[PDB]
Each structure stands twice: as C-alpha cells, then as structure tokens.
Design a protein around this nucleic acid. Structure first.
Ligand SMILES: [Mg+2]
Ligand SMILES: [Mg+2]
Ligand SMILES: [Mg+2]
Ligand SMILES: [Mg+2]
Ligand SMILES: [Mg+2]
Ligand SMILES: [Mg+2]
Ligand SMILES: [Mg+2]
Ligand SMILES: [Mg+2]
Ligand SMILES: [Zn+2]
Ligand SMILES: [Zn+2]
Lengths: 102, 70, 83, 91, 150, 98, 24, 160
RNA sequence: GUGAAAUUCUUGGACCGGCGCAAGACGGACCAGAGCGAAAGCAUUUGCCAAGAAUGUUUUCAUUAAUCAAGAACGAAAGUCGGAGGUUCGAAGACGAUCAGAUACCGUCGUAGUUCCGACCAUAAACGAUGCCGACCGGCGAUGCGGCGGCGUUAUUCCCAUGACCCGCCGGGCAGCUUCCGGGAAACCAAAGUCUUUGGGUUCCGGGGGGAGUAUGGUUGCAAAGCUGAAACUUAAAGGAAUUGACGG
C-alpha cells in the first residue's frame, strides 16, 4: 500500500537528490528525505545565566547563541522521539507542531 | 581556577569547541558545567566564541552508508 | 455556470483570453505611427518589432527589441491605426 | 574488404606472444608508424626516424619527441607548467 | 508537442481574420516586390525578409498585399536560394554542433543533440524529395556537410 | 572577439572581392602596389614573415598576423589546401576602413 | 531465502556449471 | 575601539618587540561564528565574492564579501530570491568596488575604513538598484604575503 | 573508543592550544514538496564553446505529422583492463570485544576499491512500482519562467523606463488543498475520469503459484556477466485491499 502520496520525501520534479549523513548514526539519507532540525539554543544553561551575569566584565553583555543544523534518518528521529507515528488522518497535515511560546 | 589564581589570571575568554569536522557539532554535557564553574569559582567571563571545526565540505564520514547499527 | 453564453461573450473577457483560445483569432499586436522628435516624417513601426527600426533619412533609433513589445526610445510619440 | 576482424596491424605476429601482449603493442605500433602533421610546415609528413626522433620529410625539420608518440602527455603538461612559471618569474 | 522535446508550447502567430489590405498602407504590389528583390540581393532569407518588411515597411502580410507568398515571389524572379531556408539552417546548425563535438569528446549531451538535429535533417530531406525540391540522389553526408552549407 | 570576426570577414572577402593566395603571388601584388592587406599565418617561416613585413613597409600596406596556422588559414579562406600568405586587392566587405 | 541471496546462490551454481562444461 | 560592534575580530600579528612591550600590526579580520550563522536565513539568497587585491603598500590580501537579499516591508511572498544573472551582476559589482577601495590607498586607509566597514555600506547602496541587499559585511580578510617588514613603517603606525 | 571495556598511541611528550608546509578528497549552511535535462543526473568564482524549453510574433515552409519491429545513442552504483594518484572512508582480512556458539551487529588497523585519464559492462525499488501524441470534463490558493496590464512604495534623478515589491491577466511547467465529475476490489486517483451508454491514434507487455529468469541453442564481453529463452515435473491455492481481535525487545 502506498502509505504517503508524498512518498516520504520532498522529491517532486527532481530525479536524484544528493545525500547527507545522519548526524546521529551516520547513515546516508537523501537530503530531502531526512528530518531536519534547526536548533537555536542558548550557549549556556537556562539556570546558568544568572551565575555568568555576575562574573561578566560587560554589564550589558548580550548572550551568544548556538546554531546547529541536525539531520536525522527516520530511525534516529523516531528513536529520539523528535517525530512520532500519527494516525491515518493525522498524517496528512504538514503544519509544524506549536512552539508553546506562552 | 586554582592554577590561574596562583599564576596571576583573573579573567577568561571562553572558546568552546565540539568534536567538529563531519562528526558531532553539539558540545557534550561537560560544556555547561565547566563554563558555569569557572565563573562561580571567582573568575571573570568576557567574550565567548566558537571554534568548532565547521567544514565547507568534509571527507567521507566513518561508519558506512548504512550507518552504525544499534 | 451551466448556462454560460458561448456565442456572445462580452469583449472584456475576450481581451482577457489567449489569442488562440478566443472565439475568433484576434492578434494582440498592431502598427503604430511612431513620431520621433527632431524630424518631420511619420515612420510606421510594428508594435512587437524584433528589429531596431530606422527611417530612410533619420539617423535615430526608434525602437529596441525586447521580449514581448517593441521598446520605444524616450520622447517619441505613437498613434494607433484603426484599432 | 576488411581483412581482419580485430588484430589490425599486429596480424604480422600471427598467434604468438599472447593476446594481451599483441593488444598492448597494437596501439603503440599504430602511433609509432603513423604520420603526424608537421607544426612547422603543415604537411602530414612528420614520421619517426629512431626512438625519440621525429622528422618531417618536407621541411627537413627534426624534433625530439616521445618514443612512440610525437609528443607525450608528460611533456605537454611540462611545457605548459614551464610557461606558467616563466610568466610568474617576471611580472 | 515538440518533435524532439517534451514541450507543449503554444507560442504562435494568430493571423487576423481581416483578409483586406489596410487602407493606411500606401505601398502597392510593385513597391513590395521591388523591396523583396532588393533585400534578397542583399542576402536575407525569406524569413528575414518578412520580419523586416513587417517591422519597417509596416506590411501586414506579403500574401495579402501582393497576392503571393515571399518564396513564390523570389523564385519567379529566380534569385531564390537552391536549398530551402529551414533545411539550410538545420544543416548549418549541424555543422556547428559537429565542429564543437570534435573539439570536446566528452560532450555526451552534444552527441545526443547531434542525432536529434540530424534526424530532423533526414526527415525534412525526405519531404523535399517527395515534392521534388531536392534531386532524388541528394543526401546529407556528415563529411560533405561543411561544404554544401556556407 | 577579434578572431571570430576576422574568420567571418575573411569569408566575406571571398566571393565578394578580389584576393590572391600563396607567397609568390603575394609578392607580385605587393611590389605592383595593388595589395592592400596581407594576412600571414603564424606557421609562416620566420624569414618569410620578416621579408613580407619589409615589403609591406615599402608598399605602405598593412600586415595582419593571423592567429591560426597555414592549415586553418586555408579553411578560413574556404579552400581545401594550406595558404600561408594571402593579399587582398579590394575587400568588398569593409574589413579594411577607407 | 531473501531473493537477492537466492539470486547470488544461483550465480555461484551457474559458474560451477560453466566450469564443468568447459572442462569436457 | 570605544563603542563599535562586538562581532568583528582582528588578528594583530606581532612584528617587533622592544623593552617589555610587543608591537603588533594587522594580519586579518574575521567575523565571529554566531553572527555569521545568524545571518544565514532561509527564503533569501546570499552572495559571496573573493578577490586578490594589492595595496599600494605591497600587502596582498584576500577580501571576502557576503551579501544577503532583503525582503520588503510590504512583501507578501515568503521567498526573496535573486536570479542567477542578478547574483552575477551583484557579485561583479561588489568585486570591483572592493578592489578599488583597496588598490587606491594604503594599508592604513583600508584598515580604519573597514573598522566601521564602510566598504560593505557602499556595496549595499550600489546594489539597491538591482536587488535590495541589507545583510552585507566583509566576511573575512587574510594576508598572503608581506613586504619585508620595514622597521620604520611599523614605528610610524605605532606612533605619530 | 564504548552500554561497559579492551586491541591501539603515549615522559622519545600521546591528546590538547599556536604558527606554518604538503597531499588528496568534498563543495555545508544558503538548499525549497524550488530549477534544468530524454533519462541516468546536475550546486565555489570567472572566462570560452556549442545546445535547449518556454514566452513574444499580422516572420517563413506548407502536411512536411504521432507511435514505432529491425537498427542506433546515452546510461547511477558496483565490477574489469592499462596509466597516474592515493587524504578520508572502506569489501576481503587480522585483532579486541559480545555471545551457549558470534565466521556478524560494536571498536582498532586495514587490501582491492573510493579521485582523474583512456578502454570496457549495460545492469538498479533505472519507481510516479503508473507508455507516448491529442481532445474534453470542478473550484481555490500558491510557486518557477516569459509576456501583457495596473493604486501606490522603494533604488538613481528632474521624469519615463530600468530593477525590487503590491494587485491581476495569459501560456507553459513542478506541485498543493478541496469536491458525491466519474471510476475503482478498496487503498485511493481531477486521473488510475470521459468503459456493458464498452472503438481518438499507436508501441510494449500479463494469463494461478512454483520449477524459472533455470536448462539448452544463438549472440555480446577480457572476465564478471548481459540480450533472447523453454520443458518435464509439482501444487489448491499463492497473492491484493481493507475490518475486527491478538501481539510488539
Ligand atoms: Mg506496510
Ligand atoms: Mg533514480
Ligand atoms: Mg535500533
Ligand atoms: Mg560507473
Ligand atoms: Mg588500474
Ligand atoms: Mg581507518
Ligand atoms: Mg495510440
Ligand atoms: Mg503462470
Ligand atoms: Zn540515524
Ligand atoms: Zn614539416
């Protein structure tokens, strides 16, 4: 049974997509098929900010961040629970999960 | 903190580095603890910069195209 | 719109339609009387001219070829001919 | 007609010396006995005289070249490399 | 659909239903015909003639104003080229592709295009042989191509 | 862009204007004064290059040094032989300026 | 058997068959 | 500097030392990692150019420029992509106005003009007619060779 | 380095931090249900060489066309030969682990190979598991290219262009959402529709499962193998889509 009309990848008008390596298990996955993370994390912990601010020589010192682009095969993506198997109806939508900002 | 204090150093510019290359770019759990303890031990923190090796395009990553099976 | 009037469409949509797909094939171009300044004669120019048109006597370029429509040089008048 | 199917010039060796050795020497003998165009006069008269020696029958110009080919791919890249180093030597 | 391409382009020229000569065209039949003679003697193909006459002399269709087509006019005087223009340009393109292909051996794309161009050459030539435009023994040979054209 | 232009213009010199091919004929037209442009292949013997250049200095005619060789100056002229030197009597194509 | 390995086993059988035929 | 930006970094190789003080001259400039990474966003096109330029002083430097396309305030389309020919025109434009600003003057004028990075400012302004660029800086500069290390030329830039 | 270790490297400084040099790979982020190409496939800058779709056209020829046995071109990766070069990775292999056993999964090293040139081979889940050309049959919002229009903003300048936006329209595409158009065994598909109300044109190809893509013959190749391709015999099912339950390290 054809599970997804998308065929599990973004390849629509192409014929071949150059592969990447899974950042976790180093598996060759097509670039448009692997699940991509872009995490903009604080360079320090959420509880270490207060300690660093005391020892910062600059009073108005902006906090640098970390820019990491992760790529995952669906094996490592499911194993790390970054994606989950969804119902037949719930599979179709492509909206990202809510950010839980408030 | 003890060696720097007894050698006459009071502030530091922390330069973080992960494994880099084609390997992991996320620093391990030791990054947060070592950075936090340096400031809490009575030492100043200035500019923090990243020197993680980020290739334009590296060589082939070790493991094979089927990955590290587990 | 099961009761669309295919025999008598008002020309607003016909002008909107593609030239081949109209009720009767009507071209989207014309001929314009281009009048460059500094002279006295009228030069006939195709509205979609693919060449740099020049007069018999004028040493002045009137239009330049682009994608769809002839690009008149600045300052030159143009008049339609019988629509 | 086409008198042989695949041996070509090394049909003179008969069945001897092995198929791969006749095949290996076939391309060398074709180029060694070929007539190259002279770059000095334009006539296709530049033929090998001895090993490493090439001579044009028309303009009587002798040049030093490869053993079997008129000029080896080694020396071609060498002459280009020397020219780039010369233009680098001055400015 | 294109003969040798997976395209379905509709880019054409929609001739108007108006068959009448425009009243603002004061050029007469002999005026157009001498213009055809002058430009052909300059060295312009019939396709190049019609675009120039339409753009500069403002003529709708040469068939409308003179009662005959440009190629028929050219051959009646007798100065028309012996090879048909489209066949000439196909052969001329094939010579350019062949010249580029011998310089660059590894151009597998160009070698693919050469077969496509030459197929159009041999099919068009067959049509012209049926209409007796070309001699029955005419043939497009790759060796003689660079000579017969240009 | 100069080499692609001179190839097409030399083609226009043929079948439009009068030319002459070969070294012995070129000298005759140079010393007669009716030569206008002399084109020499880079394959030319160096003695012949300087001799034609000296002749053209006396005749006040220009010398173009073709960036080909005598093999493909023949192809440029539209011939099936090698031409090493040629002279143009009258262009017929404005490759030379009045 | 996985069909790829059944294909490979058939190949090794075919190479053995060719050797025994060429021998005679 | 006093009140400049913080993401720029400079190499300052030492060249001569006397007494108990070391005297350093310019060696190269490099934008910091998190600023460079933050500039790279989706739905926009970046343009990176490099050029080998020689100062009047005899110093050979590799100038890298990075420029990102800018989406408009009223722009509704998600993407702001420059066509390949437009990218080529922008790259050539910011190559010749980068080698002009360095070939004309000496090392001193280049260094204190890239301290506020005036080059990227005029690069952005000259490109506003083709495609609006906003995130334009000088990515990096490195020194390929040095002219003999004259003692007098170092002392004057360290003094009056 | 690992789940834990260990084979391994190290007071000759192993690892680490700085400065250089050399070599060979690969072109991240930008990079998209985006583009191009007949497919395979194609991503640092610039230059050259030819090629092509689409668009615009009141340019030209005037049936020149669609599909196509035989024939031919190109064809991922792996593999073969010859010549270079070999950084990293890495079949075979070795060692350490794990295990009842472990010729494996994990780790250290490591040959062929992985890169370039030339010559082969012609196979992939070469997939959209879905022939090509043509027409007709819903709607909507987008996107790439070209073109035609239009409030206004922006870049220069004093104004048009000219770019960058905003609102539309046309054609050609990659797609997407929705629909009791219709179909279908359903999954689903605007094509897999216009099919018992069965016929637009034309190629290839299947006849229960195995035996079998096997044997043999022919043919191609250096070889590995590729193309064409059975039979005896055996069997009542093998399969497809969905439903319910059970089970899941
Ligand atoms: Mg399943
Ligand atoms: Mg594929
Ligand atoms: Mg697992
Ligand atoms: Mg291969
Ligand atoms: Mg080899
Ligand atoms: Mg290793
Ligand atoms: Mg059909
Ligand atoms: Mg059966
Ligand atoms: Zn993984
Ligand atoms: Zn000679």
């Amino acid at each position: 049974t054809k599970k997804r009309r998308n065929n599990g990848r973004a390849k629509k008008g192409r014929g071949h997509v150059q592969p990447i390596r899974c950042t976790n298990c180093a598996r060759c996955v097509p670039k448009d098929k692997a699940i991509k993370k872009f995490v903009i994390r604080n360079i320090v912990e959420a509880a270490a900010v207060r300690d660093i601010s005391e020892a910062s020589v600059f009073d108005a010192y902006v906090l640098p961040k970390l820019y990491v682009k992760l790529h995952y095969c669906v094996s490592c993506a499911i194993h790390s629970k970054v994606v989950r198997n969804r119902s037949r109806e719930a599979r179709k939508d492509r909206t990202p999960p809510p950010r839980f900002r408030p | 903190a003890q060696r720097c204090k007894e050698l006459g150093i009071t502030a530091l510019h922390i330069k973080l580095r992960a494994t880099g290359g084609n390997r992991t770019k996320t620093p391990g759990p030791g990054a947060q603890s070592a950075l936090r303890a340096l400031a809490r031990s009575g030492m100043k923190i200035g500019r923090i910069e990243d020197v993680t090796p980020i290739p334009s395009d590296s060589t082939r990553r070790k493991g094979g195209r089927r990955g590290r099976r587990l | 719109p099961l009761a669309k009037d295919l025999l008598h469409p008002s020309p607003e949509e016909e002008k909107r339609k593609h030239k081949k797909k109209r009720l009767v094939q009507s071209p989207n171009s014309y001929f314009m009387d281009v009048k460059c300044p500094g002279c006295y004669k009228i030069t006939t120019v195709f509205s979609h001219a693919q060449t740099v048109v020049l007069c018999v006597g004028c040493s002045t370029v009137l239009c330049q070829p682009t994608g769809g429509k002839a690009r008149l040089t600045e300052g030159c008048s143009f008049r339609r001919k019988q629509h | 007609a086409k008198r042989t199917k695949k041996v070509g010039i090394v049909g003179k060796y008969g069945t001897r010396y092995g198929a791969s050795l006749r095949k290996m020497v076939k391309k060398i003998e074709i180029s060694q006995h070929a007539k190259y165009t002279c770059s000095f006069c334009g006539k296709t008269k530049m033929k090998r005289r001895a090993v490493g020696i090439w001579h044009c029958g028309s303009c009587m110009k002798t040049v030093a070249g490869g053993a079997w080919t008129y000029n080896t791919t080694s020396a071609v890249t060498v002459k280009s490399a020397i020219r780039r180093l010369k233009e680098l030597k001055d400015q | 659909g294109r003969m040798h391409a997976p395209g379905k382009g509709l880019s054409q020229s929609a001739l108007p239903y108006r068959r009448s000569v425009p009243t603002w065209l004061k050029l007469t039949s002999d005026d157009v015909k001498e213009q055809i003679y002058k430009l052909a003697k300059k060295g312009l193909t019939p396709s190049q003639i019609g675009v120039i006459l339409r753009d500069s002399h403002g003529v709708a269709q040469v068939r409308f104003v003179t009662g005959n087509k440009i190629l028929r006019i050219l051959k009646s005087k007798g100065l028309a080229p012996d090879l048909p223009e489209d066949l000439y340009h196909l052969i001329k393109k094939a010579v350019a592709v062949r010249k580029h292909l011998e310089r660059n051996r590894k151009d597998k794309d160009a070698k693919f295009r050469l077969i496509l161009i030459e197929s159009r050459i041999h099919r068009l030539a067959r049509y012209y042989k049926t209409k007796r435009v070309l001699p029955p023994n005419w043939k497009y040979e790759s060796s003689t191509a660079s000579a017969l054209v240009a | 862009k100069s080499l692609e232009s001179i190839n097409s213009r030399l083609q226009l010199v043929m079948k439009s204007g009068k030319y002459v091919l070969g070294y012995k004929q070129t000298l005759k037209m140079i010393r007669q004064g009716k030569a206008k442009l002399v084109i020499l292949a880079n394959n030319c013997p160096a003695l012949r290059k300087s001799e034609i250049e000296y002749y053209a200095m006396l005749a006040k005619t220009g010398v173009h040094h073709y960036s080909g060789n005598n093999i493909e100056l023949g192809t440029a002229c539209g011939k099936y032989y090698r031409v090493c030197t040629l002279a143009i009597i009258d262009p017929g194509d404005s490759d030379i300026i009045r | 058997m996985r069909a790829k390995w059944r294909k490979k086993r058939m190949r090794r059988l075919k190479r053995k068959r060719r050797k025994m035929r060429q021998r005679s | 500097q006093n009140d400049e930006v913080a993401f720029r970094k400079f190499k300052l190789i030492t060249e001569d030392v006397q007494g108990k003080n070391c005297l350093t001259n310019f060696h190269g400039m490099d934008l910091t990692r998190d600023k460079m990474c933050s500039m790279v966003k989706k739905w926009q096109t970046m343009i990176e150019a490099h050029v080998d330029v020689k100062t009047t002083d005899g110093y050979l430097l590799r100038l890298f420029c990075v420029g990102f396309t800018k989406k408009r305030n009223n722009q509704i389309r998600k993407t702001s992509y420059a066509q390949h020919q437009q990218v080529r025109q922008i790259r050539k434009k910011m190559m010749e106005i980068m080698t002009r600003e360095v070939q004309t003057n000496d090392l001193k004028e280049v260094v204190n003009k890239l301290i506020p990075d005036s080059i990227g400012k005029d690069i952005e302004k000259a490109c506003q007619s083709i495609y609006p660029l906003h995130d334009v800086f000088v990515r990096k500069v490195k020194m390929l060779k040095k002219p003999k290390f004259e003692l007098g030329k170092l002392m004057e830039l360290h003094g009056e």
